[model samples]
Target: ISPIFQGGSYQLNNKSIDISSLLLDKLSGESQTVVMKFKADKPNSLQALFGLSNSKAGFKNNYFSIFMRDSGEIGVEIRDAQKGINYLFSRPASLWGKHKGQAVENTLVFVSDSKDKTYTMYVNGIEVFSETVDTFLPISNINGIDKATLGAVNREGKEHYLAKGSIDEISLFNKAISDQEVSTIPLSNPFQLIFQSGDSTQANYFRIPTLYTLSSGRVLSSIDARYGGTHDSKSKINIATSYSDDNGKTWSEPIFAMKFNDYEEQLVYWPRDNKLKNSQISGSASFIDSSIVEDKKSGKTILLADVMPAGIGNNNANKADSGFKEINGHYYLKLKKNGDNDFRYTVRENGVVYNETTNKPTNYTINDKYEVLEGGKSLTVEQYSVDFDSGSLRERHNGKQVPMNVFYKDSLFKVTPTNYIAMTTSQNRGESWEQFKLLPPFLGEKHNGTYLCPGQGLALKSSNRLIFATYTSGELTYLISDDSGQTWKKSSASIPFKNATAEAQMVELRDGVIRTFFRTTTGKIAYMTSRDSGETWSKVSYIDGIQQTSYGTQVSAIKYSQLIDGKEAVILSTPNSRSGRKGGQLVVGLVNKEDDSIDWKYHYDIDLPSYGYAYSAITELPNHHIGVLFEKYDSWSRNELHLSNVVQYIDLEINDLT
Candidate 1:
């Protein structure tokens, strides 16, 4: 074996050493690996070390790794810059060997690569694993050995002087490690996070990441919460989040965010079909709708979502009763902080502060039933007449009529009652939050005869106007706010319809036009625009050829100013469904103003897991990068009910079919 030392860059066979730079020559490659090692003088003294990575190119489901094959010990590792990320030598898999404490000399590798359907990884000259990956991240520049050698890069692309450790041999490979090789060789480093189990079951299936980019340059993250649940088709789901300082390129693991228990828990879905069939109801878990946003108003990032109202239970429990009972729904928010993971939130649910049913209120009830009348101003109600001589209208009490004037002021009849819509905010992005205060419900009782979500909250935009997208009487509704989120009024403009649900998305155009898109009962992706700040809407529009059979569809959008050859563009995400159980596409395009249609569009199809997936949100990053988070379920399980949120993304270079 050849002898090698540390603390300095060594040329490969004395070949022309190239520093890592954004240069296409050194950066673009099919595969690359950089590994180095050294001993820390003291605990935590191993501040910096340098080597090359697979760059963005190495990110595709590709394979790349660099390692030292000495003494069977390993240090640190960074996988794909975009995806397939793993740090097996640390934390989760750190206990793989008898080696303990810091400063212990070990092999370290920064690997990334891609090939046909397969990818491979190795550490300290040992092949640990391999997998088939379809897409690989693009690669970047190779600054010289000196540039790639140490601490965090500074302004001149020079490494800082943070004393790092020793070094040994570094090798690069352009091929994937075969399964047979991995089983036989001893890889100094290994990545155990191939995938987390999606079901709380005994089987195995890799779970994916769900990414959300907030306004404060913070990237919020999570994964589906189908953990320990059924891996079946009928699975229910939940969501979680982690924050990132980098763009969507890198993210922290799942943070146990939100969990949606069941449908009846909050009566989120009310079927007009009315036979009380056993059809499994779904929660809207699509892009842009995944409850993460960058609020332009306060410059604070806001996340708004609706879970079953409080006091509601699973469908089975709720169905055990006659179904006519109190329903609760909750809306909550978490704020961003400068440097912390612990997030605080405030939550609010919808329910009557004053119960005319019991002639009493609960401990949290702040006002009488009449105060709820503030939400009643926009709804329509029906009043029956009694045989009294005066011919006055009477209030319906438990299906019976009472004296007209006696219950007149107290009744506030026709109020399309729902749980209180809530709003919460974090001053420092999403680090901490004040959650659960009731906001206005756009649709009153007249809201399609069905109560609007008492707990659906609002999003504060860059314009300081709060926008809440919902359904009233089966049509898409948008409520507007002028003074922050303090007061709200339903924008008279609406997509008039007969039977639609509430999951929809809104994107503010660069020109300030509010573009609202929705899914229809007939299974169509429709959109309408508002020019005068949502007071009115343009005629309904569609994304050209995208439509579904209404099993369920959700849309999410993000605005972009960078023009493709000087033309502005927008990215909209919809279920990649052209047929049954076939997922939808993550589409990008130029906003068509002439006919309110997308002039140019490009569709990137998603790989739907055996578990079904839909309902997603797109989080936009400063570098024009995009991410989508969606809902996933077990497709094969006839009675299976696995459900969770999913996330994926693409680069800025992929144009919209231009």
Candidate 2:
């Protein structure tokens, strides 16, 4: 190894390397490529990696440079003759600033094509940006560039955007290269990140990761791709799903398995003021806090999430309302007619509306587009366009075109301001989804609302039943299905707790006996048990060693198929520090067969306390390794608000824990 690239890497401390001599008469034409691997000292700051300009001085007419900008956005700037310039960027999902003071490395490739006037940028083998420019300039002439440098840009004959990092294998070619060639260049990625800010051309935030791996080796990752900040509700958040066949190394593109209507998916930066809590549009709706599960019998998967109506969240939702009404032994979505004083309409089984008093179908129907119709005639109503910069509703139907997110009182239908749990199923292991259905109130109470635990549920090997440990208004509940999710029922095991809201996950320890790990306000991880397929549960008990916050976080526990130290085992993923969602660790619990108790045998720290590790989800990979996807960044946990937050992925083997 010492015989190759003996310098190792060109390290910089706000310095520059003059590379003009290396490229003398070496570059020509409009099609060119630049590939390099580097690590930045900080994120969200200006730092030039490579630069080439026509002159040895400031702001030359023709120039080419690569840089890192706001929020770890790696970008390239090419200014050609006649004032034609194109800028392309690739934003890394995580906050690279927290990446241990220049430890995380990434390979970046920039390519320009003359045939199509296209500028493309790829980071770590992912093509993040490719756009065709209307105007471009070729770099063929002999007087192209006289000044070239590594790690700094020359402006006003002085160093500007100087490098404060290390760079390696900086290469330049005179021809545009294919994506296959880009991947051939070495990349230094140790950890993988998903759901970057502004990923869907508009998502400003993402949260609630649900990671599940099928027995066939395919892993599915689902999260809340949020618009208008990361608040739980009152926003347009979609259930974005991605899969990786190679554990956590490479993931498929995000596919929104579940979404809402009305509000457009756009980026809305969080503000420090009270107004930042706003979802930017009153008509915004969402699906969030996803939970995943699969049946071993059928190989089909079920994905569930909390569905929110427009402009509603847990804090602002009318908890007393179930959002549905019972009629003739069947529950139906209650709706209010336009300009009505009462809810006189109900949406029946087939998108048709029924009069509450008559209990008969009306000519009014809601089409797939969510628009109202009567006798096939449309109901004329004004649509909305929102300016997320200020959330100004006064300027309607003029700014950015939005969908119908609300069932307004002046419109043909109006729904209750409440939350509901809904689901969609995937047969081919999440390649495609079918059957979108909202589950009715399963708690047998009139106004009980349920929330998912934000992880994967369990399929008991012994009973062959599926169960998801969920939460209701006053206690933790379980959603059980015996027929591979064809039908589901809620558990009556209402273990009352301090906070009305709770988050939990379940693992089947034995044939029919299940162990559930839950969040608690008691400053310790809580555990409970059930012996009869999750119908009834034992008294709440606290785990001995792990510390938890008073207002706890979601806990992910899966029954490990292999035993540890000859004892039954289960792995739990959570944050260790109770201070403020820090110190991410994976604990392997050894279950005592004599009793249903667990002993915390081994623990592994996946991340440090300084990086702000928060919520997590875990699944056993096909190779028996534990794969985890978790939120990274704790500043927001302290209400610090405006910053780049990301979800990171990693896989751990049992050997690492031992």
Candidate 3:
């Protein structure tokens, strides 16, 4: 028998659907038939495939249900208000003809005939089970059978089982249908690909995405334009940039915002190891892991990157020494000769390299390209500011090579100090960039040996202070600027954690306090707070409810709103995954006005499969929408590194978050 149906197909993924009224009015009498076509990646769970119950929440008390057992058995059970879970019937996978077990795609049909006092079940147009009960229960006669669901079944307030795959189609009829009627229902894909690979101008693999919204209402996106593969430090890469004026409606062509030539014109030389093969290096000077910040006081946009030399990467870099010494409670860059045990301070001022050992300025001056020039003749600084650009300065007026043990030179991988933090500024709001400005070790001749990593900077709204996360001898430190980024100082206290080679970001809280959240090896987001700007921090602790990989991954947390619920709130973007890089999620946490403690409440998923989402950045649009730029695939784990990630914007209201 063929009959009429009510609503449309329902898509399910660890979620459920409510079809109470649609089934109640149609299946009140004896003539009723329900058809379902579904597939599961993991079907061996106790999944409540489809069910009807009294409560809208779960299948308890009086109910009629179909369950997919863990042992590939299809079961039907009926429950009455007086006697719970009364009648039960099961069809094991062995009863089915030619086929061995349940497949990914399956069709189930249920028919009820009260006059004949019979109930029948069919699988793929073949009747599998039948029963003749003493008293057949009609749909209306069943006590409080007003709720129906697909994919999920709940008991109490918790979900008992949820279908882990897709349900293609579901149909309900007022009368029982023949075997022929169940075989012709068409199945279709229920998902739409929002952002696909190769849909943008980034022809190569795009990874490590960063997003920020300028005060001028433009959304700026930055990514690692990886060409040589998705390897972190060994690949040739550039920081590619793009922008959208219309709130992610379209994007501009990718522009190489931070780039360098492959030639040795700007080479900086350190000691080379003979044991290391040339293939164990990153060919040419490359830039990776870009972080963007905009100075509200001067409107100058700064893009920071970690510039690697021809052959070194993250795996080989030394994390224990920052090449700086503390003297008289202030930090100074420590430099030594090849054989000398004594160290000297780097006294660079007035665009000239000073010989602190000789207590005088050297004869050489560094040009605008950061090259050492002798009487207008460019000369190599010979292990000071030589072959690769890691922005290290040294004074050897007595004619000796710098010791430079900060670079990695171990048995596994030997590398020199060719890695340095490089910065480029844009005065026109990231439209065009100026020549790269390699940061000097000492600004006002106070700090040294601080390795500023590539990540977002913190700009305070209350003062002219700008801060960036860095490391001093494998301890977390912040590079601070009090005069609108003109001159800077390093934090005296380095935040204690397991690893300092991780990337981090900071945000100024509503209570005039600043919090720096960073990647750590704890499988959780590690954070510390500062009340006196970047001078000191609280003990390192993990944030709750956010799960990450044990090796750590980059996270972006920004102050998204000021007036939501009459309180300032921040949004965080990262992969909320525990196994590996996957399950990109956006979390909205409320910032307390008293102590700036975050109460993370609402979170939304960005991708499925729980592993491809990693390294994300978030920016608040002018219209209160949140823009997310993230790596759509787990490029760090596999060879699927040659795909472009995506930028997606979501509308989040204050009421939507707790």
Top candidate when judged by lDDT against the true structure: 2
Ranked by TM-score, the better of candidates 2 and 3 is 2
Which structure among the candidates has the greatest TM-score? 2
- Pairwise TM-score winner, candidates 1 and 2: 2
lDDT of 1 by residue, 1-658 (tens): 1112223433222122334442223334555444344343221212334434432322322222222211122234434433545432311111121111122333444345555533343433333333434454422222221224333222233322233334444433343334453344334431122113332321222133334555556766544333222221122334444556766555445433343222211212111122322333232111111244445655654444332332222221222222122224322221111243432211123433333334443332112221222333322123321121233212121243322110122232212112233345556654555533434334332221112221123343445666667664435566566665556567654555764664567767644577776766666677777776677777776656675555546566666657754556777766555444334456677766575446545665543211134555556566666545444332322332322111223333334223
Report clash pairs, candidate 2: 262-403, 262-404, 612-634
Error of 1 at 62 (Å): 36
Go through the candidates in order and give each one's C-alpha lDDT. 0.39, 0.71, 0.59
lDDT of 2 by residue, 1-658 (tens): 0111112289877888876666746666668777777766443267788877666444455666778763355667676554545444344333243232236667777787888788887776656567676765554331356767778876545667887878866777778887676767776665576667646525767788888888888999899887666666766688988888987677877777887545556565554345544434456667778999888888898899888776777778777677788877778887876577887887887778889888789998876555577787777544444564544333244344333323432355777778888878899988887746778877543674777778888888866699877787567878889988878887855565644447888888898898888887778887788998788888878887898777777778888878789988989988787677766778888988898788888877664343456778888888888888887655235243433445667667788877
TM-score of candidate 3 to 2 decimals? 0.57
What tens digits encode model 3's per-residue C-alpha lDDT throughout 1-658? 4455545456666787766556556664666777776665455357787777666444365667777654345667777765443777665430111111222356677777677676778754445566778877754455656667777654443445676555566777766665566556543322112232343323234566777788888877777765443456664566777778876656676566766433221211122222321212244446777777778888888787776654456665444443344445553334332354555434254445445578666565554554435565554322211222233322122233322122212111112344566678888776777767555453223333344544467777777788878764446767777765667667744555544555677888844588878787788888888888777888878899999887877888888766555667777777887877766677787777676788887776653433256677777777777666665555455433333222233434444444
Arranged by lDDT, best first: 2, 3, 1
Q: lDDT (0-100) at residue 562 of candidate 3? A: 61
What TM-scores do the predictions have?
0.47, 0.72, 0.57
* Alpha-carbon lDDT of model 3: 0.59
